[PDB]
Structure 1
Amino acid sequence: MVETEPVQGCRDFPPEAMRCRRHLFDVFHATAKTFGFEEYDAPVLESEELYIRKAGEEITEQMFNFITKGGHRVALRPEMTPSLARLLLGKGRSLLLPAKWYSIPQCWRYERRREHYQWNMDIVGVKSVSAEVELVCAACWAMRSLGLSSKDVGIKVNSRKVLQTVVEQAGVTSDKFAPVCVIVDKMEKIPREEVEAQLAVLGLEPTVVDAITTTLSLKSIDEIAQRVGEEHEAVKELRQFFEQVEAYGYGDWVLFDASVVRGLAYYTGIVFEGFDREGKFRALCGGGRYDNLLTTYGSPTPIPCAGFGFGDCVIVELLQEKRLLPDIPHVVDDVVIPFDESMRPHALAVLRRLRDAGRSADIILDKKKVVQAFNYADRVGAVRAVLVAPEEWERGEVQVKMLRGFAVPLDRLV
């Protein structure tokens, strides 16, 4: 035999598993359309340039890359956001803004699974927190559409500006801010002592760290205000954020967590994460504001951006745990059963009529006995079995039977 298992770390999607994936993707699509985003795509294979940010990131560290025969540096994309930036940047003044773009790219890592699908939603050209508000509400919407509630999940929200103020006041050149987020992002996962030591390696001093941990463990926006001011950008922003989410009707879904930073270098302002309220699973989704990526890529004018990624794995685990992923059995409207081979030409004409009317229909393709054909109809989840027999055809009729046996005229079938 040839190897029937897929390549290391990659999933097969036979029809059963594919119905589960469609169930999910359908929601990502429907949500995106509900929120007015526009679909886009770009190649899974990008130039390796695009992902060299040098902030010790997990996503750049764990990169599926290789060299073409021509000697060019390429890589299977680990995330979408850089591809988006390339596209947006490719369009100059010609891109109407604001722009709301979404996609469901397969993304790759080398190491544990090595690929996944990630819904991406991004808003371009909106300075205000109204964008983050929309994005966060989109993630909730999607989760709600999958049957989840604010009892089951929520979205932790923060701003990196708070910590930016604190880092800056510590005398630390602003270049250090990206690696500091990537290290502090590991605060939950790994112990307190082993995070400290990373910051010491990147040249930071002890009193400047104290203020980091303290601010990380601040429990409220009012507590942040005490430390930084009530008309600091972040406080006004976050109050506006929570006020807007409150008004849209999703206030029970969102909450402030000062420990939330995310592990990506490019986030400048608000950042967020979906999580289950039982503490069982990793982040359901993740995003934030990244107002300087496109300047970094060489845009002559800075372009404000915000968005998120919502993976295809954790959501499923969670939906299984909550018994919200029932087997989706296959369905087709009609199965057309010729009484025998002499009725095939006639069964085809029937098949053609049914399909013309927008119905999904099979016709039995092999030579088989009526009861075996009917069993088959049940097995593939036919709503209806349509028997084409010679005695009924002579009368201009067929025999129909609902699975979930009467004589019926041809016109009246549809």
Structure 2
Amino acid sequence: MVETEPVQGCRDFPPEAMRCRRHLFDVFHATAKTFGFEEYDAPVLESEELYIRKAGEEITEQMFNFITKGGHRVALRPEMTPSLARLLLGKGRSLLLPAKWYSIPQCWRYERRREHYQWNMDIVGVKSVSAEVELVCAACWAMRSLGLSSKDVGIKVNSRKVLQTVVEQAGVTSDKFAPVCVIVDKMEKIPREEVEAQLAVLGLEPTVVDAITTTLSLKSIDEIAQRVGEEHEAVKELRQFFEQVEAYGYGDWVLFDASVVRGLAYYTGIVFEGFDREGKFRALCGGGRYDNLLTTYGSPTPIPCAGFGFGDCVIVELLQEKRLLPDIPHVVDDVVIPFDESMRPHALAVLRRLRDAGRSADIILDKKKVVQAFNYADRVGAVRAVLVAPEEWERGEVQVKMLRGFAVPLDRLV
């Protein structure tokens, strides 16, 4: 006997599990379409150089990389955003903006799960917070579509610009900002002593660290306004953002949280993450504005961007807890049953007709008695059994039985 288990930290999807995954992806696709996003894809295998950002980020640290036989430094993508950027740069001026692109890539890591699917939604070429508004509303829409309400989940929202200023006022070179965010993102995962220590090695004195901590604890936008001024870009932008989400009708889903910075180096403005309101699960989704990324890759002109990722594992756990993932059995409209093998040719012609009309239909493939054929029909969740028997056939008819009997002319089947 061979190894029946999948490779370590990778999931199989037999039909039952695949139906659950399809249920979820159908929502991702349908939400994208509802919101006017266009699908794209790129190779799971990308060049390693694409993820070397040197900011101590977790997803680049835990990158499932290797070397080809020809010596090229490649990686299974740990995220999609750099791929998106590559594609955008490749198009250059031929790309019409604004663009709204989405995908559902499998993404990888190595250290626990080594593999997940991550819905990515990104808006390209929009300077204003309307992009972040749309993105956050998309994420809410998807969760709404899976049966969740604003009682079950929320989206925490912040801007890194508040922190950008505090760092800049202390005198720390702007090069240190991305590392600072990556470290401060660790506040829940490790103790405050551990994070204070990490910022010390980065090269910031205790007074600068104190100001950082203080602003993360600020509980409202007014309290930000007091600290940095009402004219501060972050204040106007966050206000516009909440005003717009409120107007769209998702005010109950969103709130301000000054502790949210995200772990990625490249976010420059508004950032956000989804969470369950019971405090039981890790983040459901996460994203933000990243206006300089394409400039760092060498775009001759700055290109504003914003987007998010929405994983496939935490959401499912939440949905299972809330009892929103009942098994959906397999279904098919018709099961065609030859009375015996001599009727098979006739049964095949019926099967053809049924399928031609857009119905999903099986035919009993092996030899079996009608009662067993009917049992099989019930097992595959057939709505209807179509028995093709000799007496009825000579009258131009079949015998039909609803699952969930009597003669019917062949033309009236469809």
Per the TM alignment, residue 111 of structure 1 is displaced from its structure 2 partner at its CA by: 1.1
Per the TM alignment, residue 53 of structure 1 is displaced from its structure 2 partner at its CA by: 0.3
For each residue in 1:77-135, what CA deviation from the matched residue of structure 2 results, as whole angstroms up to 9, or x when unmatched?
A: 00000000000000111000000000000000011000000000000000000000000
Per the TM alignment, residue 354 of structure 1 is displaced from its structure 2 partner at its CA by: 0.3
Q: Distance in 2 between matches of 1:76 and 1:143?
A: 28
Per the TM alignment, residue 38 of structure 1 is displaced from its structure 2 partner at its CA by: 0.2
Tell me the SS of whatever aligns to 1:79: coil
Per the TM alignment, residue 245 of structure 1 is displaced from its structure 2 partner at its CA by: 0.1
Per the TM alignment, residue 2 of structure 1 is displaced from its structure 2 partner at its CA by: 1.2
Q: Distance in 2 between matches of 1:386 and 1:19?
A: 26
For each residue in 1:235-289, what CA deviation from the matched residue of structure 2 results, as whole angstroms up to 9, or x when unmatched?
A: 0000000000000000000000000000000000000000000000000000000
Q: Distance in 2 between matches of 1:111 and 1:396?
A: 66
Tell me the SS of whatever aligns to 1:281: coil
Per the TM alignment, residue 179 of structure 1 is displaced from its structure 2 partner at its CA by: 0.5
Q: Distance in 2 between matches of 1:147 and 1:374?
A: 35
Q: How does 1:12-411 map to 2 (within 5 A)?
A: 12-411=12-411
Unaligned runs of 5+ in 1: none
Per the TM alignment, residue 63 of structure 1 is displaced from its structure 2 partner at its CA by: 0.5
Q: Distance in 2 between matches of 1:103 and 1:158?
A: 25
For each residue in 1:218-249, what CA deviation from the matched residue of structure 2 results, as whole angstroms up to 9, or x when unmatched?
A: 00000000000112100000000000000000
Per the TM alignment, residue 188 of structure 1 is displaced from its structure 2 partner at its CA by: 1.2
Q: Distance in 2 between matches of 1:328 and 1:170?
A: 57
Q: Distance in 2 between matches of 1:276 and 1:191?
A: 22
Per the TM alignment, residue 332 of structure 1 is displaced from its structure 2 partner at its CA by: 0.4
Deviates more, 1:44-53 or 1:396-405: 396-405
Deviates more, 1:401-410 or 1:16-25: 401-410
For each residue in 1:311-337, what CA deviation from the matched residue of structure 2 results, as whole angstroms up to 9, or x when unmatched?
A: 000000000000000001000000000
Per the TM alignment, residue 406 of structure 1 is displaced from its structure 2 partner at its CA by: 1.3
Aligned pairs, number: 414
Per the TM alignment, residue 192 of structure 1 is displaced from its structure 2 partner at its CA by: 1.1
Per the TM alignment, residue 294 of structure 1 is displaced from its structure 2 partner at its CA by: 0.1
Moved over 2 A (4+): none
Q: Distance in 1 between matches of 2:329 and 2:230?
A: 55
Q: Distance in 2 between matches of 1:67 and 1:187?
A: 35
Tell me the SS of whatever aligns to 2:198: helix
Per the TM alignment, residue 190 of structure 1 is displaced from its structure 2 partner at its CA by: 1.3
Q: Distance in 2 between matches of 1:125 and 1:90?
A: 15
Q: Distance in 2 between matches of 1:137 and 1:212?
A: 30
Per the TM alignment, residue 44 of structure 1 is displaced from its structure 2 partner at its CA by: 0.1
Per the TM alignment, residue 54 of structure 1 is displaced from its structure 2 partner at its CA by: 0.6
Q: Distance in 1 between matches of 2:140 and 2:188?
A: 23
For each residue in 1:326-373, what CA deviation from the matched residue of structure 2 results, as whole angstroms up to 9, or x when unmatched?
A: 001000000000000000000000000000000000000000100000
Per the TM alignment, residue 407 of structure 1 is displaced from its structure 2 partner at its CA by: 0.8
Q: Distance in 2 between matches of 1:207 and 1:409?
A: 87
Tell me the SS of whatever aligns to 1:291: coil
Per the TM alignment, residue 189 of structure 1 is displaced from its structure 2 partner at its CA by: 1.5
Q: TM-score, normalised by structure 1?
A: 1.00
Per the TM alignment, residue 377 of structure 1 is displaced from its structure 2 partner at its CA by: 0.4
Q: Distance in 2 between matches of 1:223 and 1:295?
A: 33
Per the TM alignment, residue 378 of structure 1 is displaced from its structure 2 partner at its CA by: 0.4
Q: Distance in 2 between matches of 1:328 and 1:139?
A: 24
Tell me the SS of whatever aligns to 1:239: helix
Q: Distance in 2 between matches of 1:356 and 1:330?
A: 21
Tell me the SS of whatever aligns to 2:199: helix
Q: TM-score, normalised by structure 2?
A: 1.00
Tell me the SS of whatever aligns to 2:74: strand
Q: Distance in 2 between matches of 1:231 and 1:203?
A: 30
Q: Distance in 2 between matches of 1:235 and 1:104?
A: 33
For each residue in 1:112-170, what CA deviation from the matched residue of structure 2 results, as whole angstroms up to 9, or x when unmatched?
A: 00000000000000000000000000000000000000000000000000000000000
Q: Distance in 2 between matches of 1:188 and 1:241?
A: 26
For each residue in 1:41-65, what CA deviation from the matched residue of structure 2 results, as whole angstroms up to 9, or x when unmatched?
A: 0000000000000110000000001
Q: Distance in 1 between matches of 2:217 and 2:377?
A: 60
Tell me the SS of whatever aligns to 2:92: coil
Q: Distance in 2 between matches of 1:409 and 1:186?
A: 70
Q: Distance in 1 between matches of 2:2 and 2:364?
A: 31
Per the TM alignment, residue 27 of structure 1 is displaced from its structure 2 partner at its CA by: 0.1
Per the TM alignment, residue 191 of structure 1 is displaced from its structure 2 partner at its CA by: 1.1
Identity %: 100
Deviates more, 1:239-248 or 1:399-408: 399-408
